[PDB]
Amino acid sequence: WEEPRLILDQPAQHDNINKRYEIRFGKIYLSRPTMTEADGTTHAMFPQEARLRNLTYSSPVYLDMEKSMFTSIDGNKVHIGKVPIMLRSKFCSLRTLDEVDLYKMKECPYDMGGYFVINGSEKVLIAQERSAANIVQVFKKAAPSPISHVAEIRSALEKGSRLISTMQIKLYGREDKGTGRTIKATLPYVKQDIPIVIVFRALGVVPDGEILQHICYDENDWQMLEMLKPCIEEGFVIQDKEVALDFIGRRGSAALGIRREKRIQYAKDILQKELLPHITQEEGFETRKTFFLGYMVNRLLLCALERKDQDDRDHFGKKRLDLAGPLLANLFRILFRKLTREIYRYMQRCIETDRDFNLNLAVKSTTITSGLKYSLATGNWGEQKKAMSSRAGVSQVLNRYTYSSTLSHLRRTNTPIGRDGKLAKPRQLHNTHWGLVCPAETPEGQACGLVKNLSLLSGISIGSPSEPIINFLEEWGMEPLEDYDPAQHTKSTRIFVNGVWTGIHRDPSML
Amino acid sequence: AKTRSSRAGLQFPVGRVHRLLRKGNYSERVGAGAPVYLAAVLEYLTAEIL
Amino acid sequence: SRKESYSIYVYKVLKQVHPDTGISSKAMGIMNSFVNDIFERIAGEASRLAHYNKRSTITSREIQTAVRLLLPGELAKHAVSEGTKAVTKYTSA
Amino acid sequence: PPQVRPSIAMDETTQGQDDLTHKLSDILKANINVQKLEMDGSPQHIINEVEQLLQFHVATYMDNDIAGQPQALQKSGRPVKAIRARLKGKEGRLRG
Amino acid sequence: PQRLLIPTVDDPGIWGVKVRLGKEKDVVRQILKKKLAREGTKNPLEIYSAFQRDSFKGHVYIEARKAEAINDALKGNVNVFSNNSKFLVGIVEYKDLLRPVKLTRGSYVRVKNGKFKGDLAQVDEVLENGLEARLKLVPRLDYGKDLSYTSKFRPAQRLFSEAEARVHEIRRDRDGFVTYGGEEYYEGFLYKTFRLQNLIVNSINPTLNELSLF
Amino acid sequence: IKQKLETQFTCLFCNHDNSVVCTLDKKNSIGLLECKKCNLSFQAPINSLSQPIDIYSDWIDACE
Amino acid sequence: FGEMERDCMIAHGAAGFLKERLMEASDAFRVHVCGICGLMSVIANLKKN
Amino acid sequence: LIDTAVKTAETGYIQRRLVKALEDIMVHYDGTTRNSLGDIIQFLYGED
Amino acid sequence: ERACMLCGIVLPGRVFMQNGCPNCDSVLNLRDSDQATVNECTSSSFEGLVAVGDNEHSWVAKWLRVDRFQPGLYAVRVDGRLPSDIVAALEQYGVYYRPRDG
RNA sequence: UCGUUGUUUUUUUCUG
Ligand SMILES: [Zn+2]
Ligand SMILES: [Zn+2]
Ligand SMILES: [Zn+2]
User: Fold this and answer.
1) What are φ and ψ of residue E199, in 5° steps?
2) Binding positions for Zn(2+) 1 (chain I) (predicted)?
């Protein structure tokens, strides 16, 4: 449903008629795994036969199509592919069938499943770990660089939970070098770093009093005000939304010829989208983006003032793990986009001749099926033609040398930090690892440390909807940012949900 | 200041006055300061009239 | 073709004295004629004064004395002051 | 000679073409192609692109790790094995 | 007398903008149809004539006077490389782009299609229309040993022999002519109807076997 | 300081690519665009943050 | 017979052992050269001497 | 453990560089110490 | 798509059998002739696919003597030679048939 | 009737 429509147009002239071809996606239907023998016979699958015959324990996927047409002058179940089904999962045959029949089915009651089967091999997915998204982190740079403190953040949608884009602020210059401490923010789809006040004005707050209201919340802390003053001075060349936006889009990484008319619109788009998308992507909410930018810059300078230790990257509380779910999600998304593009291209090349497409020769189930099979079989995580620059070794053969090894192999983790440049921070055991990952277990050699095994009582969050949290908070005096004032609200308590500020509360203890 | 007018803080081009002075058959050589003085005097007279 | 004039320079001088004052084309031509005739007069005076002292080159002092000779007391004095100030500024900077 | 670029045997009968064989054959095709532009319409822009293409295959067949430029690949997508790549590295001839 | 139509500065210029490989005729069709559909509107396509030549693959040429017209023509096409990698064409070069640019019976030609591909042959007769060209091939007959083909299992070649054909495995219409399975065998050489696309009359270097026999 | 720049900006009158030179002249906030084929001149004040692209956009707006 | 082994063998100075261990117990070969150009383009036919 | 794992590789690299630096020094019959070119490093190996 | 030998217009045979040559139906009668006539007059082989939207000032089409003919997909070169009957009829009809292969 | 030949390419988990 992420791409819930394909739309074509045809203002046919020879007699101007506007014909719009549409494809509407519908429900998905899933079946228990089955064989289609070359003899044409079919029957329910059971894993043992697969292990014996070098098969793939997979279930076909059926998607509901819909062909609707719009003409003006002025769909059924389709087999799209077979997804491998993890043993003992809800969709595996063996989740049922008692204990006795397992023996008939040639299955050890001890085996806990949790792995896929391909071409007779038993492949398992090793959980990868990545830095949490939608969080600010401040990092000090090295001595030989005008960059001193950087407060980066990566934005990813709550829905899907897929990486969207990032944005960085670079505390340029040194102490008593380059006049003041110039600050410039890097924006998506731009060809140069930009002064902060410029983007502030472009975002809606043209006057500097509002800017200093949002970024600062301790007036007596004169030092931060005066050391951010240099940025204020250099942004006086811009005084209204329009010139700021045009200045922004002028380096909008587009071609030459958009000129000012569409340049400000391009800037308005790139500020409505692609920037802090995890907050929102539509118009009428740049107040929230302003508030977030102010908070983030405030924190960045606080770390620049040494009033708080620079953020720890190894803090495990900021780490996130991705089990089979999210990973298969990403791979399926890529393959689904490929399939949709194929269907669209076939639509184009088959309606020019004006033939009612069968919807069947158009859909090549080999796309998703082949892609998933290859990705699990080889581990080169991605499209086959892009083997290079593709995360390798995500899926591994299930090592069945001894039952304990099998157990351990399943609760494995990993860090894709590469081995180019030795370093030590990622490898060393960290205090936050207490009771989440084993302290004693780890490989030897170059991988020492980068491979971690879940503690005996570990549990991974699968994600829950946040809406009820919002509903509850509002009941309990959650104050939206719109009613926020520095001098008044210098004692209230900010609230973040899933890494995004949502409002204010002045008595959070009872909350 | 690149252009000699900017070096002089005036508006009449010293370069054009100097160019015409070379093609004037008035003297063998032309100094670098006489055009500036002439430009300033002409500017003052023009401002007085205007 | 490339018949140079003093249109834009007179326009700039006018903008700095009376910024909101226009002009016609014939007034511009009259200004061009006045400026050209004054340029010719001062250059000729410099040439004659160089010839009288048998000096083959022109400095700023020749233009200064030519302006003194041409224009009367107060106007010549004011032109001398402006020329001296402009020349000194062009010299120091 | 073939010794320097022997024909691999993927599975018994079927023998694959060593990367050098593909690269040499491609350079041969390109060289023939340049020889065929002059005899017909060669509007100084087909000539330029085609000769640059020939230069490109020649350079790759001589070295395939030029900085700042994309890298020639096989239909498999794997980057080609230029002679320089052969010689350098631990696996290279000197150290291998 | 086409020479009277020599080009000059008067004729609108031409720009060659790179387009997606293999989809050049598709781009030509898009240009033509959008030009038809926008005609009479307030934003028409200001072009005169566009072409693509087989030799100039990946190159799209349109006759116009301003690069904006070319950009409009290519704008909105996914069958084109988005880059405006355009260039001009010289006055003498204009005719080159529109310049389009030996089959005789009795001369030896080769086959490149079917199960007899790679065998030199002599043309017997070119159809009156000019779509199928008869050839004089060498039969490749197993004499019914494996009748119960492909271009990878063809055994050695031999001239058709009436005696051997009668011994091992049929109709006679003339002296020396035998019709076998719809194929014509004259003096031991295979005659058959062949498509002109399956054969090439130029770029042939005779082989050692041909020298030994032919 | 005088800065020569044979940048690839497209001209509008001569319609020749890379015929546009965006010289940079920061002394008195003065911006010139020098063309090579039709040799037209565009003037525009340039602030501290001005860039050849800024002059190009100003010129484009001026042309229409 | 890795590099470090080569260096160890040098250390003891066992030249001839190192020579044979890298020719005879491994890829030995014979060739012919032209004493004028010093290349390896000689066309040798042994049975035709 | 990490310390040993890192240290071994760097020490090996240093060893390789050193060996490939001094692999041709040979004590000649005259008592001098010369590299391949015959350049003299020490007039008497270890001065004894 | 098959290219008319006279005007050079190339269209799929469906249009030829239904609506005839857009520019030579009056002299060739492609629509109301046996498929042999359509095939011979509209040869499959072609080169130089030219898209035309203007024909009045069409210098390119002016070379192809198709200024008076409606703009369309014009094949600069057409292989094969017309049967004797079609060429004789074209000559008799006052229409000068010049092969475009050269 | 001596003779008599058996892949590469990557990636992976391991051993000292
Ligand atoms: Zn120009
Ligand atoms: Zn020699
Ligand atoms: Zn026709």
Assistant:
1) -135, 155
2) 4, 7, 21, 24
- Contact list, A16 vs chain E (CB under 8 Å): 37
> Measured between alpha carbons, how far is A201 from E134 in angstroms, rounded to an integer?
81
Other Cβ atoms closer than 10 A to B6:
15
Rounded to whole angstroms, how far apart are CA atoms F34 and F42? Answer: 7
The span from the first CA to the last CA of chain G, in angstroms, equals 37
The conformation of residue A384, written as its DSSP 8-state character, comes to G
Chain I positions touching E63 (Cβ under 8 A) are 58-60
Using the CB atom, is residue A393 less than 7 Å from strand J?
A: yes
Structure tokens at A215: 């970024």
Residue A7: helix, strand or coil by DSSP?
A: strand
For residue A432, give the DSSP letter: G
Method: cryo-EM
Q: Which nucleotide is nearest to D9 (CA to C1')?
A: J7
Token reading at C57: 């080159």
Residue A379: which nucleotide is closest by CA–C1'?
A: J11
Closest nucleotide to A380: CA versus each C1'? J11
Residues of F at the annotated binding site for Zn(2+)?
11, 14, 35, 38
Q: Transcribe C11-70 into DSSP letters.
A: HHHHHHHSTT----HHHHHHHHHHHHHHHHHHHHHHHHHHHHTT--EE-HHHHHHHHHHH
A214-223 long-range contacts (CB < 8 A, ≥24 apart) are A214/A290, A214/A291, A214/A293, A214/A294, A215/A294, A215/A297, A215/A298, A216/A298, A216/A486, A217/A298, A217/A486, A217/A490, A218/A490, A219/A486, A219/A487, A223/A305
D11 touches strand J (CB under 7 A): yes
Give dist(CA B44, CA C83) in Å, integer. Answer: 9
Give yes or no for CB of A249 within 7 Å of strand J: no
- Token pair recorded at residue E94: 């204009």
Find the I97 Cα to ligand 3 centroid distance in Å.
11
Question: Going by CATH, does the domain composed of A131-320 fall within 3.90.1110.10?
Answer: yes
Ligand 2 ion: Cβ-proximal residues, 5 Å cutoff? G 34, 36-37
A225, A237, A288 from A494: Cα distances, Å: 22, 34, 13
Q: Which residues have CB under 8 Å from H39's CB, separation 6+?
A: none
β-strand partners of A419: none
Determine the length of chain A.
511
Q: Is the backbone of residue C53 left (phi > 0), alpha (psi -120 to 50) or beta?
A: alpha
What gap in Å lies between CA B12 and CA C36, rounded to an integer? 13
Residues A322, A130 contacting (CB under 8 angstroms): yes
Q: Which chains touch E (3 or more CB pairs under 8 A)?
A: A, D, I
According to DSSP, the residues that pair with A42 across neighbouring strands are A36
Q: How many domains does chain C have?
A: 1
Tokens of A326: 């999210």
Across chain E, the runs of DSSP E, i.e. the strands, are 14-18, 49-52, 59-63, 108-111, 120-126, 132-137, 171-172, 177-180, 183-186, 189-195, 199-200
Q: Compute the Cα dihedral for F52, F55, F61, F63 and give only its sign.
A: negative
Chain B touched by C93 (CB under 8 Å)? yes
Instruction: Please say whether the beta carbons of I25 and I9 come within 8 A.
Output: no
Domain boundaries, chain E: 1-99, 103-214
Backbone torsions φ then ψ of A171, nearest 5 degrees: -75, 80
User: Measured between alpha carbons, how far is C43 from C62 in angstroms, rounded to an integer?
Assistant: 9
Residue C30 near residue C6 (C-beta atoms within 8 A): no
Would you call E121 exposed, middle or buried from its count of C-beta atoms within 10 A (0-12, 13-18, 19+)? buried
F4 touches B: beta carbon within 8 Å: no
**Three-state DSSP state, C86:** helix
Tokens of D49: 């692109």
Query: How many structural domains are present in chain I?
Result: 1
